[PDB]
Amino acid sequence: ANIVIAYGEWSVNRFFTLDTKSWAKDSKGWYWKFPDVLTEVGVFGQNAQLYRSGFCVHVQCNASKFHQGALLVAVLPEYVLGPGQVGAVLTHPYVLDAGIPLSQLTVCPHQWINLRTNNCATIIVPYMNTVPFDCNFGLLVIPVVPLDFNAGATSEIPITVTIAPMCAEF
Amino acid sequence: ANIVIAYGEWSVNRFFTLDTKSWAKDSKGWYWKFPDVLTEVGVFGQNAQLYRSGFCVHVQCNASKFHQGALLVAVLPEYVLGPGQVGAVLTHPYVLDAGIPLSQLTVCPHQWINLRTNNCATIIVPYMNTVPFDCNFGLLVIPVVPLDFNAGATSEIPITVTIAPMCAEF
Amino acid sequence: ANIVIAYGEWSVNRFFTLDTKSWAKDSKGWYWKFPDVLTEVGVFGQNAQLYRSGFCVHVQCNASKFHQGALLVAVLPEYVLGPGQVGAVLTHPYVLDAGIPLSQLTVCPHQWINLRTNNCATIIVPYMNTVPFDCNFGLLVIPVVPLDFNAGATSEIPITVTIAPMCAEF
Amino acid sequence: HSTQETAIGNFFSRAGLVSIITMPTDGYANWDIDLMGYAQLRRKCELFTYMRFDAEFTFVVAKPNGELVPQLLQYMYVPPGAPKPTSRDSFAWQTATNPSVFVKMTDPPAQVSVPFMSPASAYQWFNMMGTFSIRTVGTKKSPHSITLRVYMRIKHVRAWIPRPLRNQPYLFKTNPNDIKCTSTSRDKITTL
Amino acid sequence: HSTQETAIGNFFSRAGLVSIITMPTDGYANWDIDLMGYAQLRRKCELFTYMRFDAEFTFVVAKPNGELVPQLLQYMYVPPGAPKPTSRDSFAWQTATNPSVFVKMTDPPAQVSVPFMSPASAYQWFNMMGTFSIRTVGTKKSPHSITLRVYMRIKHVRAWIPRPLRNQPYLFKTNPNDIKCTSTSRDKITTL
Amino acid sequence: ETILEVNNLKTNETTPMQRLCFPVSVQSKTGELCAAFRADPGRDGPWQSTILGQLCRYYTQWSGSLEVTFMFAGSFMATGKMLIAYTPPGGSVPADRITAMLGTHVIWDFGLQSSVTLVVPWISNTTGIITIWYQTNYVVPIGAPTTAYIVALAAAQDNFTMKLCKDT
DSSP states (O other): OOOEEGGGOOOOOSOEEOOOEEEOTTOOOEEEEETGGGGGSTTHHHHOOOOEEEEEEEEEEOOOTTOOOEEEEEEEESOOOOOOTTOEEOSOTTTTTTTOOSTTGGGSSEEEEETTTOSEEEEEEOOOOSSSOOOOEEEEEEEEEOOOOOTTSOSOEEEEEEEEEEEEEO | OOOEEGGGOOOOOSOEEOOOEEEOTTOOOEEEEETGGGGGSTTHHHHOOOOEEEEEEEEEEOOOTTOOOEEEEEEEESOOOOOOTTOEEOSOTTTTTTTOOSTTGGGSSEEEEETTTOSEEEEEEOOOOSSSOOOOEEEEEEEEEOOOOOTTSOSOEEEEEEEEEEEEEO | OOOEEGGGOOOOOSOEEOOOEEEOTTOOOEEEEETGGGGGSTTHHHHOOOOEEEEEEEEEEOOOTTOOOEEEEEEEESOOOOOOTTOEEOSOTTTTTTTOOSTTGGGSSEEEEETTTOSEEEEEEOOOOSSSOOOOEEEEEEEEEOOOOOTTSOSOEEEEEEEEEEEEEO | OOSSSSSHHHHSOSOEEEEEEEEOOOOEEOOBOOSOSSSTTHHHHTTBSEEEEEEEEEEEEEOSSOOOOOBEEEEEEEOTTSOOOSSSSSGGGGOTTSOEEEEESSSOOEEEEEOOOOSSSSEEOOOOOOEEEEEESSSSOOSSOEEEEEEEEEEEEEEOSBOOOOOSOOOOSSSOOOOOOSSOOOSOSSOO | OOSSSSSHHHHSOSOEEEEEEEEOOOOEEOOBOOSOSSSTTHHHHTTBSEEEEEEEEEEEEEOSSOBOOOOEEEEEEEOTTSOOOSSSSSGGGGOTTSOEEEEESSSOOEEEEEOOOOSSSSEEOOOOOOEEEEEESSSSOOSSOEEEEEEEEEEEEEEOSBOOOOOSOOOOSSSOOOOOOSSOOOSOSSOO | OEEOOOOOOSGGGSOGGGGSEEEEETTOOTTOEEEEEEEOSSSSSTTSSSHHHHHTTSEEEEEEEEEEEEEEOSOTTOBOEEEEEEEOTTOOOOSSHHHHSSSEEEEEETTTOOOOEEEEEEEEOOOEEEEEEEOSOOBOOTTSOSEEEEEEEEEEOTTOEEEEEOOO
């Protein structure tokens, strides 16, 4: 019952799997911009070229019990800075390149990813806009605690993101 | 039924006995400041270092029938001038060192101590403050009539003050 | 249901935590003498200067799964040799400095502490004396099996002792 | 006679002049709120310890000679803890949390009301409601001398702990510091 | 304390100064409507994404020295998309679909209200309500310097999508573009 | 809940990312003080980064109860105990571990429970002392990391009230 519903309320149907990011000790963070990053994926590849859909995202990390670290996943409606399946990399993870500090990032719906007790987390968010039929929201995954491990172990910890759209009206 | 209730309305439980003041012909007056003077007494000695309590004070004077005189005991909420079990001594009993005349001192709750018909008096006062959990009030005992006696009698008349806290919430 | 009742029968209330002893490979053992060691702890600090109380003691050891070893905890009424929160150290753990062999120590109420399947143990003992109102009993914790570990691990395994007095009549 | 005139409410009801502010040919004057400013209304409140009252203020503006000029002035209230303006062009005058009253000299005197500002349940006389600020609008000086007087009423009077009055004259403002007899004298006891 | 003071409505309720307009000895000044004009009231609205609010405006006119002169001025609102006046004698001032408010300097400040102007359901901060126009009536210049200030309130506040505040200082007006720590420091960890 | 900054130092100014968490290592012995910070939501300090401390800047009088949450991002096979003590307002800083046990305290063992909630009883502005003491030394096996980080979170309760709006 770790399902996190955003803001308390709720061949097209299938599980889309994005690329697996390599997350190392010296890394910073990654972010995806929905729907735009998903428009090139699968059935939506030829579909995008109005849309009303809810989004169910799953963030899973496969790591052994010998590592340590923590991530933070969140959903920020209308995230504007101040992109393909590769996403991008934040050059200033403290301000998230928004000029907005990282400590207050938890105001938005979030779930804590801790390599100790939990290997996976998910966030169910609905469609939120002033106009019902239309860069809706970005997905921010940044480590709070950097990775530390003894020599001889695996230096890269894969992070996968699977998108499962629910209640899609095109 | 000489019990005087202030303003018409109402191992920690025991009788605390303060020092006995020597009251002579040339004296002026004494005053105690609650709770501060009581904080060094008995169980409250280590307790004071918020408090909500009612205070029941007893003023008793032991004197023979050959003497004469009268005292005045009163309770003044937030008495500020303009201290240990020894208390202090008023240098100007007329203004009570407040610049406030002695004749109007009877506006506050009081009981007359007259060496003729009564050897003891008591005043029951509750806790009065703007903030319920916090120098609340001073105790003014000053003679109106000085002592006069024939030679050969006892020149000092002891005055004892016993504190009996009632309804104490710490 | 690992609770061990001694001999088959049963602001003052709170959990007192003693110091954490560092237990290494070359160590021998420690012992505490109740009530005397507890008299300087917390509320009992000013209380001790007759007592009737039952004692509930908890012995917990925090160790990883890579170590190995076993302890022995016991309650010996009127343990006399032949002390502050620091306790003491047995110079001859075989005779326990009583001239009494260690192999028979299990006659008294005891529970086996084995770093394999159990990280904690407790013993509930009542007050036992010829006079009901009065060095009642000592607490003997000595390893049967010494510690052995590979290089690179933590050489000190903390051992904590928490005292929870139950049915205390002063 | 009825009991309505001697009631606690009608005793503090009448208005009084609590301040005098004069601006020479400065530009701004900051005046702290105090009821102890003058002898009257002071002795009256020392009769009691705890007092709970709403405050009503009146802003009357004029010149030294009394003639009125069509000049716009600003009346601002500064809550307790807020920074005081250091000049006319400073930032405190554009602050949104500081209420302002824009009135002219031809505009009849404005009336503002200040609720109970203390964190406790009542004031203790034995008390800071904040301070004011007043300036002439514009980035340039105004070639008119402004002398204003502030009237203060008291609404919803509540009283507790009656205290004996002070017979001796007052020395300092913040402390009730040659003793004087509270009554007159006469040459003999039996004389009338 | 009650929940009425910390409510969303009372947080944006207090008025503020959103503009400063000065006319030297020009004749007309066009000012665009923006809530981002000053530091205050700006940081507050970036706490939220979607906001739906009515706008209340206040027109206060005066001179640089503060004295008032019996001069008639015109206050016109220009809806979004309408052409802006290029001069005082132009056609935009006689346009019937542009509302006007005729007030004098002795006339106490007028108050106008602007409804919700956006085609969407709410504003997006991460917003143009139109522009104003102001001129002195008549075909000739007015020999008086006019310096006016516009006050703006917010009525019927609605909020959605709470966002984290911006710790870094603002750079430009239209974009949230040397990183600064959001908190102070100390020499050790165990020091108080 | 939001993240506070307990790691605030002059050295961490160049790399603000290390400010989020504070280290715990095997070198620390029993009885040492890991971190100590006062909690006033308004004043500048560890509470300036949270959203609560920022909203308390627009207001003068605030009061209520608070909550502090800790998180352990360390390795899974690591075990150890941590003392979390709170000194009542108006007291003194605890000198050692034994003097902080007499007050409000909670035993936090990350070998089983990974987080706890410390409730500050009362605060007023017209402060408390939160200290983190070492109970047992950090126990690590071979191959496991010898240094762990703990992230501190905090959130206001329902009884927290505020009034007298003042801009800054």
